[PDB]
Amino acid sequence: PEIVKQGKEAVRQYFQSIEEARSKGEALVHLQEIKVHLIGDGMAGKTSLLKQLIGGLNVVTKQAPNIKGLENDDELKECLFHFWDFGGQEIMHASHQFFMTRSSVYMLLLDSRTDSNKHYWLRHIEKYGGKSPVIVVMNKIDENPSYNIEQKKINERFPAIENRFHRISCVESIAKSLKSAVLHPDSIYGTPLAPSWIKVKEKLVEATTAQRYLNRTEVEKICNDSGITDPGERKTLLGYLNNLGIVLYFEALDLSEIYVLDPHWVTIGVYRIINSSKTKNGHLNTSALGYILNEEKFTYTLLEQRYLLDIMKQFELCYDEGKGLFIIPSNLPTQIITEGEPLRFIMKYDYLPSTIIPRLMIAMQHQILDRMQWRYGMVLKSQDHEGALAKVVAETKDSTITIAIQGEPRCKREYLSIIWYEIKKINANFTNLDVKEFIPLPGHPDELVEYKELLGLEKMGRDRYVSGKLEKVFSVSKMLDSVIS
Amino acid sequence: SPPPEIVKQGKEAVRQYFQSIEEARSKTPLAPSWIKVKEKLVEATTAQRYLNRTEVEKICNDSGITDPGERKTLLGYLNNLGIVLYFEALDLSEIYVLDPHWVTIGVYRIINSSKTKNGHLNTSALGYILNEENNKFTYTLLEQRYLLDIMKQFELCYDEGKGLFIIPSNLPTQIDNEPEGEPLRFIMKYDYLPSTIIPRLMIAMQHQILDRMQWRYGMVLKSQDHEGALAKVVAETKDSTITIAIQGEPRCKREYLSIIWYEIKKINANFTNLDVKEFIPLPGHPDELVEYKELLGLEKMGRDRYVSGKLEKVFSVSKMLDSVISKE
């Protein structure tokens, strides 16, 4: 059982489906479908590499025999490849977790001129895809023969590369790595499916791609035509295909009229919103959608536009404030305290996802001050906490989130924990994220002690935190009871 | 009133600059003779790739610059401005004043050759590397010899060498013979870490790089002068950090660290803004760094235990400091 294991009744339907197919004497087929995410700085040759193999958003889908290295390979004759290029903006992440973590191959593209961003992109792949296989391609080698990277070290730190490093100029080897990635013990070929599921998938794909989306009646016809009539498994099948990002299906919205969608039409929809000059400031005037989507192949009617907004909401890319004015936090301006003993609490990421602050802003929308919110932070006020005032700011250069709070001491602590929680809840959506929590030293805002350090000093039964470079001692408990207790 | 280029060039240049203006008076501002020489040198160096000492001296004497010291400060001036290349350190009158472009694409061709893929320049390949791999871009035996000398002056490579030159920036990222007893462990963390630090340290320490134990991001130094002490200097680009691990007797260890540390500092000084903090790892726990000035603070305050909360353990501050620097 794949991670369709979400839904007790889902688990049941899957077994049921491969039981009737076992009883009718049919062989359990495989999905034979894969997502290749091209990852890299703008042009480190994403288009050029792709040109080499086949002979801003987009997909190109190519079957294995057409990929440069695999022409005569039988093992995956029937296999499909979906080359995805998100900006570096992983739009599917919030609502389609598995789209990124399952069924995926990450293909990192580096060159001499882009080499220093390698560490960033390596962690980017780690946190978005999970245990997904990764393939490192070094490009433009013809211009700099000496160009290489600390492979051993990189492979030790990132065991999902499994030594799939390639030096390329003027490629058939990258196809062996692709083959290797697809056949991963835990990727697609590990899950037997009933022929039914594969049949309706194919019919569903042809349809959605051709006629932007399908209505409830249409998909139900397709399902009966392949002899899937139980609504309980039809839901789980669509559930499954959605989880895999083959076809989109939003059970939360559940509109009969736009029931199952071509992933491409939806993605090109939100990108046009995201990158429109009429949302350049972080404000979407609903009126503008017609212009944005249609005049500024892929056309969007009035109904479609409303639905697309809802998808953005589901993707956690925006929120309604109630004027027909949505906020898109990631497009906000980059630019827009010290009452009592202001509680400060700092969170150090090894990689700070650029979706964190946008997603926290949504979780917290109700408490934002006087629209005192910007690309890198927000001001939060809760009457529920005597009128405490908190500032959550994000510094990209340090991969750090700072929380400063004003108010009575019981208020501060309890407020922190609710902001702290919401942050931790977002963090959990990313795989091996690595956050360390700090506390500035009293009288020395820039000197930080690790919260883990203090707790450890308490378990030891020590009350002194000794700063050698300052030559001052501090009460472990006193600064600790400012945070929890 | 002299320009920075002349100042940097030393006292004699500043004097020679002044002689130049005082002399003209009787007949950045400069004398009509310096521009005349410049104009003629530029003119000469677009029909010739270079000029010899005689040719240059002739051009100079025609503009009235007979003083050999004045000649040398003006060529040094023109050099510092990349208008005309001139290498005071080098001693070959045959190739005396050079065309910048001819040098530029010469050094480019060397460093970016497929024959220097892995940091080894096998000089006998030079004729091939520079010519075959615009007839202005020809390089004869003597001309390729000189190019190496320029490259050494630019600290891009050194001589191993039985016709073998090392180009550190081009060395493999990993090697087959990397090696690994209370070894001294000392690390420097940078705000930014120039790529040229390791290559430059290698040129400075080259005599002690003993078994080709050198890769792009590190080197193993072996000191005959420190009872066979072995030092392992590696740079890690992620943390922007340099780590020094030394193996030897206690005195030998920290003696040899002062030498390595000192060289890197003298490298660090060529960069206008470098922030470098010094750390020491906890015995048994390499991942866990404690700052050097922190351990120093602890000793002045007079306790001998460093207390780690993350891992419920205490350590001797005296032992840790003693691993890097004697008491005093």
CB neighbourhood size of A366 (10 A): 7
β-pairing verdict for A80-85 and A33-39: parallel
C-alpha–C-alpha distance, residues A53 and A171, integer Å: 7
- Would the CA dihedral through A292, A296, A298, A300 be positive or negative? positive
Virtual torsion, Cα B130, B133, B134, B137, nearest 10 deg = 0
Q: What is the SS3 assignment for A439-479?
A: EEECCEEEEEEEHHHHHHHHHCCCCEEEECCCCEEEEHHHH
Chain B residue whose CA is closest to A460: B312
- At residue B316, what are phi and psi to the nearest 5 degrees? -80, 120
Query: Which value, in Å, is the radius of gyration of the alpha carbons in chain B?
Result: 25
Lookup result for tokens 């409830």: A216
Virtual torsion, Cα A301, A306, A310, A311, nearest 10 deg = 10
Q: Nearest-CA neighbor of B276 among B244, B234, B246, B240?
A: B240
Inter-chain touch B113–A460, beta carbons under 8 Å: no
C-alpha–C-alpha distance, residues A325 and A286, integer Å: 6
3-state secondary structure of A260: strand
Lookup result for tokens 């080698």: A141
Query: Which experiment gave this structure?
Result: X-ray
Inter-chain touch A469–B291, beta carbons under 8 Å: yes
Q: Nearest-CA neighbor of A263 among A251, A246, A281?
A: A246
Lookup result for tokens 């000189």: B146
Chain B residues 77-116 within an 8 A CB cutoff of chain A: 111-114, 116
Query: What is the DSSP secondary-structure string of A13-71?
Result: HHHHHHHHHHHTT---B---EEEEEEESSTTSSHHHHHHHHH---EEEEEEGGGSGGGT
| Mutation target vs A (from B107, B110, B173; most A CBs, 10 A cutoff) | B173
| Mutation target vs A (from B157, B174, B280, B292; most A CBs, 10 A cutoff) | B174
Chain A residue whose CA is closest to B174: A150
Buried/exposed B42-55: b ≥16 CB within 10 Å, e otherwise: eebbeeebbbeeeb
CB neighbourhood size of A348 (10 A): 16
Q: Cα separations (Å) of B233 from B174, B176, B184, B198?
A: 14, 17, 12, 9
CA angle A161, A162, A164 (to 5 degrees): 70
- Would the CA dihedral through B18, B21, B24, B26 be positive or negative? negative
β-pairing verdict for B305-308 and B313-316: antiparallel
β-pairing verdict for A104-110 and A134-138: parallel
Looking at this protein, which amino acid is placed at residue B13? A
Inter-chain touch A151–B174, beta carbons under 8 Å: yes
C-alpha–C-alpha distance, residues A160 and A147, integer Å: 22
Whether A464 contacts A474, CB under 8 Å: yes
Give the number of beta-carbon pairs within 8 Å between A and B: 79
3-state secondary structure of B143: helix
Q: Cα separations (Å) of A149 from A108, A399, B152?
A: 13, 24, 25
C-alpha–C-alpha distance, residues A251 and A37, integer Å: 26
Q: Cα separations (Å) of A368 from A196, A314, A381?
A: 50, 21, 6
| Mutation target vs A (from B117, B241, B320; most A CBs, 10 A cutoff) | B117
Kindly state the tokens that stand for B324: 């890097």
Virtual torsion, Cα B203, B208, B211, B214, nearest 10 deg = -40
Query: What is the DSSP secondary-structure string of A193-225?
Result: B-HHHHHHHHHHHHHHHHSSEE-HHHHHHHHHH
C-alpha–C-alpha distance, residues A198 and B114, integer Å: 50
C-alpha–C-alpha distance, residues B122 and A431, integer Å: 48
Whether A46 contacts A53, CB under 8 Å: no
Give the helix/strand (H/E) hosting B18.
helix B11-25
User: What was the resolution (in A) of this experimentally determined structure?
Assistant: 2.9
Which residues in chain A touch residue B237, judged by CB atoms under 8 angstroms apart? 116, 119, 150
Which residues in chain A touch residue B172, judged by CB atoms under 8 angstroms apart? 148
3-state secondary structure of A160: helix
Lookup result for tokens 């470079």: A469
Chain A residues 140-169 within an 8 A CB cutoff of chain B: 143-146, 148-153
Give the helix/strand (H/E) hosting A128.
helix A118-128
The answer to whether residue A444 neighbours chain B at the CB level (below 8 Å) is: no
User: Bridge-partner residues for B239, per DSSP?
Assistant: none
Note if the bond before A130 is cis, omega within 30 degrees.
no
Helix axes A231-243, A216-225, angle to 10 degrees: 110
Which residues in chain B touch residue A111, judged by CB atoms under 8 angstroms apart? none
Chain B residues 199-228 within an 8 A CB cutoff of chain A: 216-217
Query: Which value, in Å, is the radius of gyration of the alpha carbons in chain A?
Result: 25
DSSP annotation of B154: T
Give chain A's end-to-end CA distance (angstroms, integer). 44
Kindly state the tokens that stand for A366: 């109700």
Buried/exposed A282-306: b ≥16 CB within 10 Å, e otherwise: bbbeeebbeebbeeeeeebeeebbe
Q: Which residues, in sequence order, are CB contacts of A40 under 8 Å at separation 6+? A: A46, A108, A109, A110, A114, A121
C-alpha–C-alpha distance, residues A467 and B106, integer Å: 55
User: Nearest-CA distance from B306 to chain A in Å?
Assistant: 9
C-alpha–C-alpha distance, residues A403 and A344, integer Å: 6
C-alpha–C-alpha distance, residues A79 and B193, integer Å: 45
User: Bridge-partner residues for A313, per DSSP?
Assistant: none
Which residues in chain A touch residue B217, judged by CB atoms under 8 angstroms apart? 150
Q: What is the SS3 assignment for A401-442?
A: EEEEEECCHHHHHHHHHHHHHHHHHHHCCCCCCCEEEEEEEC
Q: Nearest-CA neighbor of B146 among B87, B192, B229?
A: B87
Which residues in chain A touch residue B298, judged by CB atoms under 8 angstroms apart? 466, 468
C-alpha–C-alpha distance, residues A70 and A79, integer Å: 10
Inter-chain touch A145–B117, beta carbons under 8 Å: yes
How many residues appear in chain A?
A: 485
| Helix spans in B31-173 (H) | 32-44, 53-63, 68-80, 100-111, 126-131, 141-153
Between A149, A153, A460, which is nearest B309 by CB?
A: A460
Which residues in chain B touch residue A453, judged by CB atoms under 8 angstroms apart? 308-310
Q: Nearest-CA neighbor of A148 among B184, B296, B118?
A: B118
| Mutation target vs B (from A140, A150, A459; most B CBs, 10 A cutoff) | A150
Give the up-direction half-sphere exposure of residue B24: CA atoms within 13 A in the CB hemisphere: 16
Q: Which domains does chain A have, with CATH numbers?
A: 1-31+190-261 (1.10.10.10), 32-189 (3.40.50.300), 262-336 (1.10.10.2200), 337-438 (3.30.310.200), 439-485 (no CATH)
C-alpha–C-alpha distance, residues A455 and B310, integer Å: 8
C-alpha–C-alpha distance, residues A397 and A131, integer Å: 27
Whether B100 contacts B91, CB under 8 Å: no
Lookup result for tokens 């090109």: A268
- At residue B195, what are phi and psi to the nearest 5 degrees? -65, -25
Kindly state the tokens that stand for B48: 């010739």
Q: Which residues, in sequence order, are CB contacts of A310 under 8 Å at separation 6+? A: A250, A253
| Helix spans in A158-301 (H) | 174-182, 195-210, 216-225, 231-243, 263-275, 289-294
Q: Which residues, in sequence order, are CB contacts of A120 under 8 Å at separation 6+? A: A351
The answer to whether residue B305 neighbours chain A at the CB level (below 8 Å) is: no
Which residues in chain A touch residue B301, judged by CB atoms under 8 angstroms apart? 466, 468, 471
Whether B291 contacts B278, CB under 8 Å: yes
